[PDB]
Structure formats: C-alpha cells, structure tokens
Design a binder for these strands. Structure first.
Length: 187
RNA sequence: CUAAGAAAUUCACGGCGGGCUUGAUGUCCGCGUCUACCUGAUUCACUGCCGUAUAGGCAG
C-alpha cells in the first residue's frame, strides 16, 4: 500500500520490548479480525537478522482511511501509554519490496506421530519408527508469543522477512498482517 | 649433550590358646537477631488441519 503508520515501543522499566511487541501484535491481530479484509500488512523496520530481533518498531501498511480508523479503535486502549505514534503518511519512493510470511515448523515430532495415528491407524512404535526425533526443526528467526482465544495454547509465531524485490505483486494478507502473497515497501 | 650411559629380589609358610573393666554423680543461672527487596529473562517451540508422506504448506 501507499500509506504507512510507524508504531514504536516506548522503553519501559517494567517490561522488555519483546513482551510489549507480542501484546501489540496480539491486539493488532484482534483488530484485523474485527475489521476483516486482506488489505492490511505489517513490517518491522529495525529488524536484526544477526541476533534474531524484531526491534522496537512496527510499520503497518494500509490505505489512509484504514489507518485513521485503526487510530481511534479500542484495540489501542491500554497500550497508548506504552507506545508512541507517528502519522499515517505516504511511503517514500523508491523502495525495495519484501514479503512478511509466517514460518511454521515440525518442532513437535510427537504431534506428527499423533497425526499419523489419526490418519493411518498405526501404533506408537510404528509412528516412532516412521517419525524419528531428528525431524524437529529449530528456527533462527525472531518471533512473537501469542495466546489464542479459540484454543487455550500459547504459541511462538516465527516471522521471516523475505528477500528484497524491486517491485510488488498483488496478494492478500491474513488477519495477522502477514503476507499471503502481498508485499510491503521496505524502508 | 642431564652424578651421563646399564640392571628380574624370589621360591615356601597354621598366629591360637584363655579371660567379669567396675562402683558413684545436680550442668546452670541470663538474653530483642533486625532492616529492604519485580523471579521474569519472548522462558508454554503448543494444539490441530491439508497432504500417502517423515516432503512441503496452513490455522489460532
């Protein structure tokens, strides 16, 4: 999109930036379910690939009316004293483009064993011989930790910012602001 | 370039027999331990779905 809003974490004595980053991402996800649509995507400008850090900025990309609607909604109630806003402003030009997609992994071999039990009626030893322990993949990606409201689990949502492309293509976003095809301007 | 330079201790073996340690006993007065704290560092790498798949994706 052509408009962006930069949301920076204020430094807090009581909270690390990753905790406030996760809470802001969670309330943003609830705001995108409350809004609907696939037109709104996010980006993390001070990302550090070396230490796997998301920084302390979130850059949301949408139209201008969407950003001005999201300024005055109750998804920022309780977070306004931990954050500072810029203005919804036009993206500078030219900028490279990159994708912001969630990267899931097979980090629980036992869950895949239970899936093979449910789909092939096998046993525990058949699943453990068919799925060994070496298939687990640990990620060198920064992440936010959310709690679901439908189910009662807490999960690390790992994020990877894709390679820089000189142009953007058409694609929608999920209700997490993440790329299901769409691209955001990286600056 | 060394008080340098060298070196086979080893064959065999019955330690056992016997025994009353005993009497007696006042530990004991007295006592101000206080003061003040972020356990949270992403610290719950989870649950499930599509797929024949462990290959690869997806959902919260």
């Amino acid at each position: 999109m052509d408009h962006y809003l930069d949301i920076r974490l204020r430094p807090d004595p009581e909270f690390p930036p990753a905790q406030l980053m996760s809470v802001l991402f969670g309330k943003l996800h609830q705001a995108l379910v409350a809004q609907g649509g696939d037109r709104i995507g996010v980006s993390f400008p001070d990302l550090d690939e070396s230490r796997s850090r998301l920084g302390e900025r979130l850059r949301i990309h949408a139209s201008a009316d969407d950003l001005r609607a999201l300024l005055a909604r109750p998804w920022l109630e309780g977070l306004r004293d931990h954050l500072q806003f810029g203005e919804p402003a036009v993206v500078p030009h030219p900028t490279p483009y990159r994708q912001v997609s969630r990267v899931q992994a097979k980090s629980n071999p036992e869950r895949l064993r239970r899936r093979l039990m449910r789909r092939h009626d096998l046993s525990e030893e058949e699943a453990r011989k068919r799925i060994p322990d070496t298939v687990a993949r640990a990620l060198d990606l920064p992440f936010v930790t959310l709690r679901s409201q439908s189910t009662g689990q807490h999960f690390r949502l790992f994020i990877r910012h894709g390679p820089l492309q000189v142009t953007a293509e058409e694609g929608g976003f999920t209700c997490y602001g993440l790329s299901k095809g769409g691209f955001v301007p990286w600056f």
